[PDB]
Ligand binder design. Sequence first.
Ligand SMILES: [Mg+2]
Ligand SMILES: [Mg+2]
Ligand SMILES: [Mg+2]
Ligand SMILES: [Mg+2]
Ligand SMILES: [Mg+2]
Ligand SMILES: [Mg+2]
Ligand SMILES: [Mg+2]
Ligand SMILES: [Mg+2]
Ligand SMILES: [Mg+2]
Ligand SMILES: [Mg+2]
Ligand SMILES: [Mg+2]
Ligand SMILES: [Mg+2]
Ligand SMILES: [Mg+2]
Ligand SMILES: [Mg+2]
Ligand SMILES: [Mg+2]
Lengths: 101, 49, 34, 116, 110, 145
Amino acid sequence: FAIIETGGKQIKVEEGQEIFVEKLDVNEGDTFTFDKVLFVGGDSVKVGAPTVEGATVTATVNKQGRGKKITVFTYKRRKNSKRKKGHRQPYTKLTIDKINA
Amino acid sequence: MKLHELKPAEGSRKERNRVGRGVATGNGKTSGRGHKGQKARSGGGVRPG
Amino acid sequence: AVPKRRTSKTRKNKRRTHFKISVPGMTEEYKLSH
Amino acid sequence: PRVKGGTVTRARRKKTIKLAKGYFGSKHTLYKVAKQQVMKSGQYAFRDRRQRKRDFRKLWITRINAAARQHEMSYSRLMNGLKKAGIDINRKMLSEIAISDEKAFAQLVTKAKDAL
Amino acid sequence: MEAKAVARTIRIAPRKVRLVLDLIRGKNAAEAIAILKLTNKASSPVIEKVLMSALANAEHNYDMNTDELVVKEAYANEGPTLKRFRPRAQGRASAINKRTSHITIVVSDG
Amino acid sequence: MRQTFMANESNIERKWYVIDAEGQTLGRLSSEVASILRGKNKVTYTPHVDTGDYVIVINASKIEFTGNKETDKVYYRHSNHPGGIKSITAGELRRTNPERLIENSIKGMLPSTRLGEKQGKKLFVYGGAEHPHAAQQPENYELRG
RNA sequence: GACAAUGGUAGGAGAGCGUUCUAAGGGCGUUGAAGCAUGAUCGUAAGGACAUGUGGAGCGCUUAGAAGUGAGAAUGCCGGUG
RNA sequence: UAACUUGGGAGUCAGAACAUGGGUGAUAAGGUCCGUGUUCGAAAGGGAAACAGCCCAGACCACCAGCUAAGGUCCCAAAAU
RNA sequence: ACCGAUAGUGAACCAGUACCGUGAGGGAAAGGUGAAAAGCACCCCGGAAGGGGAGUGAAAUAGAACCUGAAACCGUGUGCUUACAAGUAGUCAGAGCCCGUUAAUGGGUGAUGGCGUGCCUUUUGUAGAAUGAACCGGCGAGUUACGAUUUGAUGCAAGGUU
Ligand SMILES: [Mg+2]
Ligand SMILES: [Mg+2]
Ligand SMILES: [Mg+2]
Ligand SMILES: [Mg+2]
Ligand SMILES: [Mg+2]
Ligand SMILES: [Mg+2]
Ligand SMILES: [Mg+2]
Ligand SMILES: [Mg+2]
Ligand SMILES: [Mg+2]
Ligand SMILES: [Mg+2]
Ligand SMILES: [Mg+2]
Ligand SMILES: [Mg+2]
Ligand SMILES: [Mg+2]
Ligand SMILES: [Mg+2]
Ligand SMILES: [Mg+2]
């Protein structure tokens, strides 16, 4: 298993493993490389200061859709003051194939 | 101009301001006439001067 | 001396657990006419 | 000309009754009451997804001042150690490692403990 | 086969009838005419003409045997009312609500 | 949602320990005992189930009070009747029924939920020095400095 | 797009959703209209489509115009029921 | 980064506490009347056990990511017995 | 570019009627089977009411309260859950047991844990022990005509209009 850092946060993975993430700039049927590793134990252990070198993951993408809608609402009492709106947040999807380049 | 493509000029027409038809319009219960006095009365005010 | 509230649909029905009736005896149909 | 209100009324009134579903008693049949709890459900939810972020940052530290205690280490002198090494790994990761293994957690800690 | 019969605009409240029916449901048939006429109520002589119409049509219309033939559904449901008035102490008056019911029985074999 | 593993009923193994109450201050002990019942010091601690362990206490009677508070550490009580403030004890309880005095200081350090009562029904306290719970191989537990 | 700002009562200013009628244009319907009940559907909001059942003769769409044009509260008026 | 002028359209004239400078009162009152500033009013979120005005601090929507103010680190209850 | 059965007339039907008042005088409620009466011959249970079969019809769950048929309210059945428990009644988290969608990061029930004093109006300030609301449904409040003053858009210009 290996650790990455990805957008604003960290994730850990293994092969044959769905993994979701905040949106990225690619088309479908294509590949991507997370140039950011911070720890890999496995058995060939390697941990140090960030962007540990010699570790660039490979993967593949599957879908480029959006999430599900939540509603938003607030109100102050005894005062005629409210609000409503909607949100439906996007996501990229992946699967992991190989662990370094 | 064929009776089903009709478009007057820009800036000519407008929609009214209807009053006391909810909260979000900005003119709801009180309808301008803020709170209780003589100016908030049906047939209020004063002859000018 | 006057109800301050409304009686819900449950508290009305939690109360009638015992507001049923009973069965006669059973001698062979024949009555228990001692 | 005349406008008698029609179905706009009982439409708007059951897009709410259909949201109040799983609620006790007359809070899934009545509009004047349902409407009052659908509202608070919006101000509670708004408040919870800014507090969820404060719950789970307790478990992650709950579960590191257990694991460090095993090997003669507080939480503070652990998270101070790596401040010199430079490990910028978040919690939510140290929870899932030290729950799983010990051997990485043997190296991991010994450098935090090294640099002090 | 599932026969039935209904009695319609019968002049008793439902809340008074429903006490007898709970003693009648999920039982045999000749184990019901007996328990009915040994229950001192006023509901009982009208739920007794309403089995025996569901048993006399599983013999001439649909051809089943009365030997084993049980009761699978009996229930009462509200009906139309009849509004009346009782006078009181001062000039005031007070409501009266004379109520009705519909009765429904189902006899089945297995 | 993501990677924050939960414990459930299956993923838990609960154990039985032993502790000695000779030459110890009262609450200084019970601060360290109510955590073992509660599920800290494991790495599977979750706050909606019972992940903690069983704890046996022996020879309660040899428990010390500093200063002078076997006379002015009163334990009040009431009975929902008029004039019923029963100051039934001061510090006699060390002598009579010592097997309770240790059992109320610990149940106050724990919460008052449908669960934090249950994880105090896994405490066993004796003023003697022998326990009938030898069927379960209860280990010892020396303490923190 | 490199910086930017956005809590809000009285109140002012701006952009729009929906209902009923009319005019012109183009269209759907006994191979099932409006209305009614279900559903896990889309849009930044008011609100909009699609299928499936009952129903059994009349409704939408595009653009402009005219208004008895949107209710939870008035010890509110009328009817039904607890 | 603001002001000055002219013109169209409003609302308000019961104000409170806290600290400070002074009358009246009994160096009494969450008294009552004036002056200078901060907050409630019209403002949510942390701490003071609970609390409209008190110390920190000004919410565009979303996330199971992270650094410090007020106050705080034996257990309830997060962090140095 | 008028209403379409709480509307339009006080009255679409038995309407200045029933009903209230010594009298003068005051005032309601209530429309719809089907294209066609072909308006259920006959058998069975029951004293009759009403229902089950048969038969007319394109359909009788269109059978004289008959076009459609919402909601409150009242009930029958059962997939998950509930008799050591302190509750503005729900929100975020989260195991089990039962299903299988407008095909999506699915839906129903929820043993346990954290937070949490309803809505509107009036007030310096209200969970308030300050007011009003039993519940559901329909109706129910800045308009129109003449004059004035400003802003916007247009047509002709030392001229412009009846
Ligand atoms: Mg406003
Ligand atoms: Mg209002
Ligand atoms: Mg005024
Ligand atoms: Mg007898
Ligand atoms: Mg704003
Ligand atoms: Mg802001
Ligand atoms: Mg129409
Ligand atoms: Mg209107
Ligand atoms: Mg005033
Ligand atoms: Mg001042
Ligand atoms: Mg009608
Ligand atoms: Mg017709
Ligand atoms: Mg005010
Ligand atoms: Mg006052
Ligand atoms: Mg009241």
